Amino acid sequence: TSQVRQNYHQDSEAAINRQINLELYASYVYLSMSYYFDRDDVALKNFAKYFLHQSHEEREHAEKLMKLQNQRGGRIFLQDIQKPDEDDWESGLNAMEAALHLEKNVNQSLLELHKLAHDKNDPHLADFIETHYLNEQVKAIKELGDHVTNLRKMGAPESGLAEYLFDKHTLG
Amino acid sequence: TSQVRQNYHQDSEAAINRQINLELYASYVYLSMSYYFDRDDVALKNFAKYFLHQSHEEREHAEKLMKLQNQRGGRIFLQDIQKPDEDDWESGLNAMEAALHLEKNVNQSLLELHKLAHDKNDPHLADFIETHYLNEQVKAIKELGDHVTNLRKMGAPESGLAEYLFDKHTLG
Amino acid sequence: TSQVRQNYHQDSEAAINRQINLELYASYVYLSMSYYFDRDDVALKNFAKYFLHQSHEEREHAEKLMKLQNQRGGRIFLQDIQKPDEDDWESGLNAMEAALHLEKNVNQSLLELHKLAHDKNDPHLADFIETHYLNEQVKAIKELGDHVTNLRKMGAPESGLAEYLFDKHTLG
Amino acid sequence: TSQVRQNYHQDSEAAINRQINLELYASYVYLSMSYYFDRDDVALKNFAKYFLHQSHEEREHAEKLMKLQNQRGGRIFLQDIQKPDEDDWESGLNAMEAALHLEKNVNQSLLELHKLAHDKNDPHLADFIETHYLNEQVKAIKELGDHVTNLRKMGAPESGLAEYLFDKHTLG
Amino acid sequence: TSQVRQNYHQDSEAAINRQINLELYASYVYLSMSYYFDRDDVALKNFAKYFLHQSHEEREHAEKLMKLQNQRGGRIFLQDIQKPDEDDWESGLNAMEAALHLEKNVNQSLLELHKLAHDKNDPHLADFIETHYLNEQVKAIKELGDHVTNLRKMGAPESGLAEYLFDKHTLG
Amino acid sequence: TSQVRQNYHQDSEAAINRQINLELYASYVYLSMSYYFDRDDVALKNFAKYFLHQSHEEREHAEKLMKLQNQRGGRIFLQDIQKPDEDDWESGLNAMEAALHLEKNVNQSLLELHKLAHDKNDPHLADFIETHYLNEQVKAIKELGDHVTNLRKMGAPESGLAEYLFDKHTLG
Ligand code: NA
Ligand code: NA
Ligand code: NI
Ligand code: NI
Ligand code: NI
Ligand code: NI
Ligand code: NI
Ligand code: NI
Ligand code: NI
Ligand code: NI
């Protein structure tokens, strides 16, 4: 038992570790998307920059979660970061939809973790997840939905010119 | 066959992918060290910052390798980033020695890759590894050896005061 | 025999002269493309500026090669700069593909020259070609491949509007 | 027939193309002189810089002529740029006299072209050649004559010290 | 065996030590030339400054070589710095020719060392010598050859006025 | 006999040459110490910087002595710079004591040279040695004695932590 541990259950520690691993997996998937849009036959630099920024944001998420785990007295247990389920993300709209699904899964996991923290009578972790992630994930999901809608309203993926214009005007 | 592929063997592509995975593993190990020195019972902030910077440098290494793979016409195939073989790095000198061993392994892998590139008559990748990694890895190994020597000449790990002074004066 | 000649074979001198002539031919082809996109019935100013910049870069390449020839004690022997095999480059995508083929030919010639220099035990010229041209040609080939991919993903050459948009957004 | 062609004869177009080729040949000869004065056994850097600047000026001349050809509705037809008739320009005074002869030949060609334009009732091309080249060629010929006179009044080519002093004080 | 030694043969270490001693000898010869041109009966200050700068450059060469030896795990073994074979360097052209011969000998030694490093499969030391010395020695040899040519084209050593003018205009 | 020689004995010239050789030997020993503290198993950067600065100061001493020799009409005769009697300076306190002994020997040589100059009725060289070296050597000996005392009052060489603290706080 750590000297700084106070009102911190072991289930919350396991959930924090699992969310750390989930954020690592999300950053891995975002990096995979970024360097898939870096290929010569794809040639979409703005999508690559955006997905690299998203991977860095998920890295910051994981770092903040590990710092919070070290603060609450819990111990960190890292696991194997699984590779993305895909290596060729087809087009831009497919990558945006996959990122939207990943963000929704991360949001569901964060909501389950906050429900657990509320059941554990842990207001600190509750408000931490509320102010540091919930609104962030909501904004990210809204932005990805807007991007998917704009890509569908232009002819993608059937129109590569539409994806080029979305790379230039929107993500540029 | 890519339209930009020219004097680029498939063995070189596989070696580039394996080196990308190795750099990812090195960054993972460095992040594990950094957040192991972030624990409350450890309390060494400068070691954490240094290992986080090393993890970011290995991330930049992997990104540059993936960019070079995309330039030479080869395709990227990511794998599962294995977790570090340890979760408790004992003390500071043990972590420095483990980082030294990891750097020496990465240097051996880079030397084997350069030998392969020379056997494939690929001067571009050869000089790329020469100017972008070889001297960098040599400097890193020399710095880690100096750190290990200074830690051994102060009483570490038997003297926690020595590790504190090395964290304050050297890595501070 | 020059007083400054040292570890410099005559075959390397002939190869340097041939590469100088090749760079001159490449600059001539780039200037031809630039002023073909300057015609009234073509009207693509950004393509003209880009090809003029590429011609100036090949001119700098030839000047650096002649300076290196004067440094290594060898003598320069200039030949007739052949005219481009075409006077009407059809459209923009055709010109980009021709520039890609020319860059790949120049890269193959540089790789053969570096192989010869390695067989002549000339590390100076080897590293010179490695650091001053190899990565440059790789970047140029990658950029031309990205341009060709973007032109093919927009409707060119069947869509002149696509070529206009590529001239405005990309090369503008 | 171009939509912008107006009062522009085909003979004027052929003369413009021939003058473009002549300016290209002049730039080639100037570059040959510049890199002949770059040799180790010659060692005259200021002469090399001056001849390189003259080659760049002839390149600008050719570019302006091609732009004027594209403006007047005519089409450009490039030919093979012949190599200079010499590869060893003896000394500095010989190179200056050869440059003077080349400038006088270019001036004669420009005067013949202006006479043709006047016979074709083309005042635009006439005044263009008058204001953009005639006075320029006159100034260049006067400067080359002054340089030849100063080189002859110092002992060149029989005095290499005279050529060194002309490189240092005059062209420096 | 050092903890940082990796892919570093003992023959390469001996060659590095011998090259360190050679650079020390070159710096000694350059200092001897500099302070020979400092004598009252000689009175050539610019030659003294130039040779002192060359001696300092050879000192920096030796320091960089010793730093590289300390980096690659090898141990440094210094020897006796031999005095220059001459104490009166006759004139300026003789000193320039002696410096040219010394630079050519150092270049031959560096080329032999790079050949040895390539035979030892050491790309790090190979590229180090390539980028940090080879082009530097080539530029130095070219500059010394140009200086010798200019001194021979002015009347030196039979004309002390020529040496004075070379000291004032060139090396001044 | 030089035209500028006046009240300058040949014994004073020989003593000046011997002192030049002694300063060269001192600079060599200081450089050896500096690059001995540069080794990986030593790892003391501040000691290396201090000894390199001392070597540069002895180099300036030798240069000033050679300039004074050229001023007084005497001729310079350089000899072989002997290597240091040691290649492994044990620890920091041993190197400081060796530097102190070398400084005391140089001071004794300078005092003997000043006594000779006074016996030769040479006030110029006397006051030159007085104002340009005597107080400098006294300050250097006092500083080295203070360093040795501080190293002995901390536990060196039996305490490597003491040497590390002296490198950080004092020489840092
Ligand atoms: Na190289
Ligand atoms: Na006095
Ligand atoms: Ni996240
Ligand atoms: Ni790395
Ligand atoms: Ni080889
Ligand atoms: Ni080129
Ligand atoms: Ni012209
Ligand atoms: Ni008329
Ligand atoms: Ni050197
Ligand atoms: Ni001294």
Curated annotation (Swiss-Prot), chains A, B, C, D, E, F:
The lineage of its organism: Eukaryota, Metazoa, Chordata, Craniata, Vertebrata. It catalyses: 4 Fe(2+) + O2 + 4 H(+) = 4 Fe(3+) + 2 H2O. Oligomer of 24 subunits. There are two types of subunits: L (light) chain and H (heavy) chain. The major chain can be light or heavy, depending on the species and tissue type. In the human liver, the heavy chain is predominant. The functional molecule forms a roughly spherical shell with a diameter of 12 nm and contains a central cavity into which the insoluble mineral iron core is deposited. Interacts with NCOA4; NCOA4 promotes targeting of the iron-binding ferritin complex to autolysosomes following starvation or iron depletion. Residues 6-155 form the Ferritin-like diiron domain. The gene is FTH1. One of its GO terms (biological process) is negative regulation of fibroblast proliferation. Fe cation 1 binds at residues 23, 58, 61. Fe cation 2 binds at residues 58, 103, 137. This is Ferritin heavy chain. Gene3D superfamilies: 1.20.1260.10. Expressed in the liver. Keywords: Acetylation, Cytoplasm, Cytoplasmic vesicle, Iron, Iron storage, Lysosome, Metal-binding, Neurodegeneration, Oxidoreductase, Phosphoprotein. One of its GO terms (molecular function) is ferric iron binding. Its EC number is 1.16.3.1. Its main location: cytoplasm. The record marks 18 as: Essential for association with cargo receptor NCOA4. The keyword Acetylation applies. It is linked to Hemochromatosis 5: A disorder of iron metabolism characterized by iron overload. Excess iron is deposited in a variety of organs leading to their failure, and resulting in serious illnesses including cirrhosis, hepatomas, diabetes, cardiomyopathy, arthritis, and hypogonadotropic hypogonadism. Severe effects of the disease usually do not appear until after decades of progressive iron loading. It comes from the Eukaryota. It is found in: Cytoplasm; Lysosome; Cytoplasmic vesicle, Autophagosome.
